[PDB]
Design a protein around this ligand. Structure first.
Ligand code: 3L5
Ligand code: 3L5
Ligand code: 3L5
Ligand code: 3L5
Ligand code: MG
Ligand code: MG
Ligand code: MG
Ligand code: MG
Ligand code: MG
Lengths: 207, 197, 202, 202
């Protein structure tokens, strides 16, 4: 599934109709994906993941920083299924961050711990697909039973990387979005909605 | 005016959300996702407290269809109230069209919030305002999850303004069915026929 | 399934460790059952209900006013089960108030042939629910079950036991989570023991 | 405040009263702190944090791994406060694992209100070490929030600024707290059975 298709001409929502941190009011243009919509989609995704990856021990990899909200919420919905259903399997977690002869993968346990396990990579957004590709390579060379990619967002943008994510929250236009742990120079992570920055905000927090 | 939903709103694919399977063939699209309703209701809760938070609030639930909006709106208002330096009492009552119009005498001198699921003709809102005002409250306000763009009809708090199409879910029914649905949805052909009177 | 048994010597919780409306502070003794504990218990109760009643159309009957919160949350947990399971059953809802005479509600004949779930806030003597069942039984439901958030241990009990129980409590006067004292404290999200200095005010 | 003080004689709750993942049914002995109770406490703690620290830019620092759930939930409560307030403050987040592994540049802490979030304080060694590091970079302030504080004679004598629960000298798992990486996928804080400990023993 490509996930919830958010069309290129999606207008989003007026900021004044939602609850927002008032110190971001002029830094945002529109609410793009309301927090609650993310929850509803993430509920379904949790079931899709259990459908495909259930039946054997899952190792859930959180891609920091931007993946942490989606990760926490996805796993909570998975946990909700597993304690209210007959079908259930153990799930362990790990956290990696890519470096701010290529990208260093900060942290993470011994790579042998993924061997023989159903591995779920959880990302915030697929743009160039290079983040996803490096992580797929970094996991595959330790022979898990399977590797799957969950991503909150996928941008409709030209991509050389072939692999398509297995679980997708929303497929969005090529707009620069923030919120729900997605940042602009470390700001907007505390926003619960996904929003499009304004040119004002982009200039205000520019590094 | 609330969150304005267009006439050409395509809604969302059912297969992208969690829905009860027994309605899978009776629904066409998800129209307003549950989470969107929650987000909008969080904002409305803050709006309500800004206007009415100065004195004892009586929240009046309009059964049946208003029960979920009522429960959620109140929970958000309760959340604000227990995290504020200054709080006010809140009490509740329930009416259905007038059933439960017995001992509304404690509406007197209070800030009364009528909570409805949908305003279409406005006849329900009109009827309840007429009744509540006779108890001489300190104020009367109306919160409605949905307002339809229909010639018939104003509410003080509005979740969403929707087209003139038939919606179900989030306690809104079609012949008493579809209330057990967290989303607001558009009913299919088979659905309207299957649950027809 | 008697529910979470709360002992006579349950100390409850200091009010200052939780969030509560500040105007209720002097009127409460302790938090007795935290909101979250109610949610956790209600979650399990939802699944118990579906295992027992999920084979056929459910009519969820809310006993206003005190039963409304438990009703709303219970059904929400039941709804979560229903939309995430391969199998699922229709559910309708109705509302009545007991003043004993029944106020409001659909025609009793709508309950016929259905699995009827009666949702209540508290059972004390049990006379209220016993009378209610005696009326509903006359219209031949496939099944009638009662879910009560609270059940009091008391010799005043006539012997009626509900089918689903949140919490079995001592004979203390509790308020909150839609349970009231003269229409007050319903806006409390926890169940709390009311003060004698609050009992006298309201 | 020392938080919610749980006694050495705390019996916990029977597993059959709550929703439990079936792959841990044999491995767990008892629910110790229900998930909802944690939420209720975390809500109050969110308000305490903002009262103290909500006057300047807060840097929320998560101590991986076991702190991640408490961190995410505490932040969500703080975010809820912040978006429903006339005056709002910016918040940034960072993650670290203890040798301190992979954080932001330590220079980002300077002049900020740093909130360290941990799952449990036991010997206090971990936190005194971390606090020694952070203070060398002259933050405006440094507070510590820990979900649990263990009541043990084995303690350096360190007390965090915000405490969820003070527990007995017992081994607990759940709510991201682990036993050999297991039991993180559990919403409740619980006590493992002897059969569970042997099963997941290194
Ligand atoms: N907040 C945000 N909003 C966007 O619309 C966006 N598009 C790309 N990116 C960068 C996302 N980025 C993922 C994480 O980048 C942050 C790494 P940092 O520069 O060390 O903070 C690249 C995804 P890709 O490997 O598939 O191209 C965005 N970030
Ligand atoms: N389920 C549903 N979907 C709709 O799109 C709709 N439009 C009007 N109505 C009738 C709603 N109706 C309110 C509820 O009618 C009684 C049914 P109950 O509230 O489910 O017990 C009249 C509103 P009005 O006095 O402003 O015209 C609709 N119902
Ligand atoms: N708020 C509250 N706290 C208590 O601790 C309590 N104990 C008994 N009751 C009264 C319960 N109940 C009467 C409920 O009062 C008024 C109905 P409402 O409109 O839901 O508030 C009798 C049940 P029974 O036929 O099994 O004896 C209590 N109410
Ligand atoms: N799961 C669990 N249950 C316990 O009751 C417990 N007590 C100490 N510990 C180990 C906590 N430990 C830190 C481990 O933090 C959890 C993150 P992890 O290292 O990724 O598992 C030392 C705290 P201290 O320096 O104040 O003594 C426990 N773990
Ligand atoms: Mg990525
Ligand atoms: Mg970035
Ligand atoms: Mg109406
Ligand atoms: Mg009752
Ligand atoms: Mg730790």
């Amino acid at each position: 599934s490509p996930g919830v298709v958010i069309s290129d001409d999606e207008p989003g929502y007026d900021l004044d109709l939602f609850c927002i941190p008032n110190h971001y009011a002029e830094d945002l243009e529109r609410v793009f994906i309301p927090h609650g919509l993310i929850m509803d989609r993430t509920e379904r995704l949790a079931r899709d993941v259990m459908k495909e990856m259930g039946g054997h021990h899952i190792v859930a990899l959180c891609v920091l920083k931007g993946g942490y909200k989606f990760f926490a919420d996805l796993l909570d919905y998975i946990k909700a299924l597993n304690r209210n259903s007959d079908r259930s399997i153990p799930m362990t977690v790990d956290f990696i961050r890519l470096k701010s002869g290529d990208i260093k993968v900060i942290g993470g346990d011994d790579l042998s711990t993924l061997t023989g396990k159903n591995v779920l990579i959880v990302e915030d957004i697929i743009d160039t697909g290079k983040t996803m590709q490096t992580l797929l390579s970094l996991v595959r060379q330790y022979n898990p039973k399977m590797v799957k990619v969950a991503s909150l967002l996928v941008k409709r943008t030209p991509r050389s990387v072939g692999y398509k994510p297995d679980f997708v929250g929303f497929e969005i236009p090529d707009k620069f979005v923030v919120g729900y742990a997605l940042d602009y120079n470390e700001y907007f992570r505390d926003l619960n909605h996904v929003c499009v920055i304004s040119e004002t905000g982009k200039a205000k927090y520019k590094a």
